[PDB]
Structure formats: structure tokens, C-alpha cells
Design a protein around this ligand. Structure first.
Ligand SMILES: COc1c(F)c(F)cc(C(=O)O)c1F
Lengths: 300, 257
């Protein structure tokens, strides 16, 4: 129900909280974010005013612990920390709330945008993609490479997305080369869903997490992973009806939220044209096709 | 990367390589039906797999039975080609396997890459060269073995006959591409040049006539003339005016995508 207090804001910075953002001035008496909705993961993110290359943030869930942000003048960034002393934390939050030095998470009552973008995203799955087991929150930034990108270098600071490679022995059964390359159903249903993800919810959770890291950090590898997971479904002739109907909802809200001015960097022409107009599922994504045709008809 | 004019000597180095041409795998005649619709009838085809250094030709005959009850035959043909090239590589001893496979058509890249996943060190490359390997079925003995086949068959040829006893692989390939380009441009006129003189025959174990070195120079000149004459007839160009740069440029320009 909770609050992420800030020690101070010593450097001018754009702060993101989920899909919202606001500008904080150098040494402005800012002491954090209150009224964060319980029940969802959240991401607090940063872009320094004096250096837009500093673009980074933290995935967290207020149900797992008491988290605060403190600026580190050595490493030159806003760090998330956990406070183990519940009484101290409550006392600090109460002080800042009484002095009205926190911004309020600005959720419109009617507005399901954040739920719609994070429906399948769980903190325990984020912590397996982003490996730093001593913290309950996960650091991501614009420059972090994926395990797949590193294969084609520091393995500790990498995004452990599931590797998808259409021209790999994993994707192609010996003896079923043409079948498996032209119809990715085997790779989707047996290898990925039954084999690695165990269920569609885990698959969608990773797809949604990839999109959010692409959008909020401009993380290029995350963008590749998001498109690969879309293309793997759209390129499969055999997909459960429930998964197609849900993918249509998922993509609709992603396309709805995407900033218009970032469509040229965040959307892959080839994948979207293929998925909407050529693939097995070209007629299965009604809501996605309509929003894409009305918002980004130049890409198509 | 892509095999082009810049990297032509690489064809004749000591790294085993094969060209794969799939343009005669799926072959049809188009005809009217009794109801006045149109129907295709498949005829036997072949994969043209050639070592350009040794002249070794692995002619895999594609019998019409391959197509029976199959759909999207032009797509299947690329995958059947990749399947058979993959099978040929696996059949060869390790020291005879190619280091590189060059496909004459870019549509063969994904099918061959996917069939060759077990061979990550064999490079699959396109070429910028416009190679006249489609004219293989203008070589009478290759046409004869394809059309007579009653089942899938592999037949091994040396497409250079015994030329490498007297000339380099580079020159042998240049002679082959000029003959095939002439056969592709004007088949009747090319066969006339090759076969009209009855005192020069084809050995039982050869594909081409037993020309002396001086007779090969004459034949080569007559093939160049045929290609230039046909380029004149095509584009309505007075070829009698052209210079040697113009002429060289037109014959080799046709060897270039
Ligand atoms: C935001 O202020 C806090 C806070 F909430 C907290 F839990 C701990 C500290 C600390 O430095 O030990 C702090 F400065």
C-alpha cells in the first residue's frame, strides 16, 4: 500500500514510476513516492538531466520489503536499498508524508493500464532474468546485454531472457526441417511452453517484462526478445485460442502505451508486417491490428 | 559473405567447395485441360552440385514421384534440394566434405542452412555471379540420364572431361561457363557449333567433343560470337561497330547479377 522514500535528490533527474514521470531539480526537497498500488510489480526509473546516457531503474514489489532510494555520489546514481527495521522505516515515511515532501502515484480510478501491461509479470520471474540474489529488487539499465546478444560480456550484469533462435537445433527436429521452419508450433508448444516456460502465463510474463525494459530503458536486447516472442506465436499454425485472445489484449495495451515519437526505434517493421499480414495468426489479432493501423500506419 | 567478381580465384583454391543450382529440380510443361483450364505436368529434374576445382558433378536426379500428392511444389523443391545436398555431404567422408556451399539462388539459403545445422563449420553463401547452370539440361548426356530415370538416382560426372590434364581449373571453369552461357542464349546454334563437324566426336566417357587445344580456341571464339550476335539481335544493336572493351564488357557483364 506503500511508499518508496528518497534520502534526497542531489542531482537534477527525470524520475519514472511505472508509466508516469516527473522532473526533480538539483537539491529540490523531494523525499519520494507514496500511494503505490499494492498487488503489482513496479519500476522506478531515472534519467539524469546532465547526462541522458545514465538511464536505469529498479523493479520491485512493496509486498516483499521496505525499499528506499539514496543517491551514491561515488557511483553517481540513485540506488535502491532495503530497510530491515520496520519501525525506523514507518517513522521516516510518516515524517516525509506530514511535511508533504512526496509525490503521489497518480492512478486514475478507471485506468487499468498498469495491470494490463504487467498482468503476467511476477517479481520471482524478474529475479531469475536479472540475477542479484542478495537484493529483493532488480536493477536494469539501457546498456545491459542479453545472454543471446553475448553469445553472438560480463555474465553477472546480463538479462537472462530465454534464448529464441529460429535457425537452431532447439527450434528444428532432425527430419522435420521444412515443417518446423515454416510452422513453429513444435518450438512454441513442446520446446518453449511444455519444456521451458511450463505455461502460457510465464511466457507472457517474460514477453511483457521484455517490452517494459525496451520502453522504459531503451534496452535494445529487450526489444529483440519482445519481437522474437511475438513472432514465435504468430509463426505457429497451432496455438491455443485462449493464448491468441490474450496475446491480442497484451499487444493492444503495449501499442497503446508506446510513445508515438519512439515508434521508429521500438517497432520492427519486418516482424509486425509478417505477424499482422503474412503469418498463420494474421487474422487472430483484431484489436492489435486495428490500433497499429490507426496509430502507426507508416510502419505498415 | 557473398561470392562475387572480387573473390573469383577463391573458387580454385584448395578449400573443398560445391556450387548448388536448383533451377532444374522442379520442371513442368503447362497445357490446356479438356474443359479449357490450364494444368502442369511435372517432368524429371535434377540438382546440379559441382566442385569447380575438380569438375566433379553430383547430379541427383529428381524423379516426378517426389511431387506426388505434395502441395506448394516450388517451395518444396528448395527444401528437397537442401535435404539431398545435406544427405550428399553426410555420405562423403569427412576429408571430402565441403568447407563452403555456394547457392546460385538466394532462396536456397534458409532451406540449406536449416538442413545443415549439424555442420556449423560449413559456410552457406550466396553469389553475385550470374552462372548459367540452368543450361545443364542442354548437355545431351545429362538430359538423357534425367529423362530416362524411373526412380531417384545419383549419377557422378566430371563436367570438364579430361581438360584439367592440359588447362588450370580457372580456365576449365571459364570454358564451362562460356559453353553453358552460349547453350542458354541460343541452344540450337551452340549445339551446331559443338556437333556440326562429324570428324570430332564425344568419347563414350565424356560430355563434350574431343577438341584439340587450337580447335578449343576456335570453338570458344564461335561461342563468344554467338553470345554477341544474340545480344545484338535482342537489343537491336549493330555489333559490327563495337570495340573489344565493349565486347569483353558485354560477355562478362552477363556473368554478373
Ligand atoms: C529515505 O530515508 C532513509 C530510509 F527510508 C531508510 F529506510 C534508511 C535510510 C538510511 O540511510 O539508513 C534512509 F536515509
Amino acid at each position: 500500500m506503500n511508499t518508496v522514500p528518497f534520502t534526497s535528490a542531489p542531482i537534477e533527474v527525470t524520475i519514472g514510476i511505472d508509466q508516469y514521470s516527473f522532473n526533480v531539480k538539483e537539491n529540490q526537497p523531494f523525499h519520494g513516492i507514496k500511494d503505490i498500488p499494492i498487488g503489482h510489480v513496479h519500476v522506478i526509473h531515472f534519467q539524469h538531466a546532465d547526462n541522458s546516457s545514465m538511464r536505469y531503474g529498479y523493479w520491485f514489489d512493496c509486498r516483499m520489503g521496505n525499499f528506499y532510494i539514496q543517491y551514491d555520489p561515488k557511483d553517481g546514481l540513485y540506488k535502491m536499498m532495503e530497510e530491515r527495521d520496520g519501525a525506523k522505516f514507518e517513522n521516516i515515511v510518516h515524517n516525509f508524508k506530514e511535511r508533504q515532501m512526496m509525490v503521489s502515484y497518480p492512478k486514475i480510478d478507471e485506468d487499468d493500464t498498469w495491470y494490463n501491461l504487467t498482468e503476467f509479470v511476477q517479481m520471482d520471474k524478474i529475479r531469475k532474468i536479472v540475477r542479484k540474489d542478495e537484493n529483493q529488487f532488480s536493477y536494469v539499465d539501457s546498456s545491459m546485454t542479453t545472454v543471446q546478444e553475448n553469445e553472438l560480456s560480463d555474465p553477472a550484469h546480463s538479462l537472462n531472457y530465454t534464448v529464441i533462435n529460429f535457425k537452431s537445433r532447439e527450434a528444428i527436429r532432425p527430419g522435420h526441417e521444412m515443417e518446423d521452419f515454416l510452422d513453429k508450433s513444435y518450438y512454441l508448444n513442446t520446446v518453449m511452453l511444455q519444456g521451458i516456460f511450463k505455461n502460457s502465463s510465464n511466457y507472457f510474463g517474460e514477453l511483457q517484462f521484455a517490452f517494459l525494459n525496451a520502453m522504459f530503458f531503451g534496452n535494445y536486447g529487450s526489444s529483440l526478445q519482445w519481437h522474437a516472442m511475438i513472432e514465435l506465436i504468430c509463426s505457429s499454425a497451432t496455438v491455443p485460442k485462449h493464448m491468441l485472445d490474450k496475446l491480442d489484449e497484451i499487444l493492444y495495451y503495449q501499442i497503446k502505451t508506446l510513445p508515438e515519437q519512439y515508434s521508429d526505434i521500438l517497432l520492427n517493421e519486418r516482424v509486425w508486417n509478417i505477424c499482422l499480414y503474412s503469418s498463420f495468426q494474421k487474422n487472430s489479432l483484431h484489436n492489435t491490428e486495428k490500433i497499429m493501423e490507426n496509430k502507426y500506419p507508416e510502419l505498415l | 559473405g557473398a561470392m562475387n567478381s572480387s573473390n573469383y580465384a577463391e573458387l580454385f583454391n584448395n578449400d573443398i567447395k560445391l556450387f548448388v543450382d536448383d533451377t532444374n529440380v522442379y520442371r513442368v510443361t503447362v497445357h490446356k485441360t479438356f474443359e479449357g483450364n490450364v494444368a502442369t505436368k511435372a517432368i524429371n529434374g535434377c540438382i546440379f552440385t559441382l566442385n569447380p576445382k575438380t569438375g566433379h558433378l553430383f547430379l541427383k536426379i529428381i524423379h516426378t514421384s517426389v511431387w506426388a500428392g505434395q502441395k506448394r511444389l516450388s517451395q518444396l523443391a528448395k527444401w528437397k534440394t537442401a535435404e539431398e545436398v545435406s544427405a550428399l555431404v553426410r555420405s562423403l567422408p569427412k576429408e571430402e566434405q565441403p568447407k563452403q556451399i555456394i547457392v546460385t539462388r538466394k532462396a536456397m539459403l534458409d532451406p540449406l542452412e536449416v538442413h545443415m545445422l549439424d555442420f556449423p563449420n560449413i559456410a552457406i553463401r550466396p553469389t553475385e555471379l550470374r552462372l548459367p547452370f540452368s543450361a545443364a539440361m542442354s548437355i545431351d548426356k545429362l538430359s538423357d540420364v534425367v529423362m530416362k530415370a524411373t526412380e531417384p538416382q545419383m549419377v557422378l560426372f566430371n563436367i570438364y572431361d579430361d581438360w584439367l590434364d592440359r588447362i588450370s581449373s580457372y580456365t576449365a571453369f571459364s570454358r564451362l561457363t562460356l559453353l553453358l552461357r552460349a547453350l542458354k542464349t541460343n541452344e540450337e546454334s551452340a549445339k551446331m557449333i559443338l556437333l556440326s563437324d562429324p570428324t570430332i566426336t564425344i568419347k563414350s566417357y565424356h560430355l563434350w567433343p574431343s577438341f584439340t587445344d587450337e580447335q578449343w580456341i576456335t570453338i570458344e571464339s564461335q561461342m563468344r560470337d554467338l553470345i554477341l550476335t544474340e545480344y545484338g539481335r535482342k537489343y537491336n544493336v549493330n555489333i559490327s561497330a563495337l570495340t573489344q572493351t565493349e565486347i569483353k564488357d558485354i560477355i562478362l557483364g552477363q556473368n554478373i547479377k
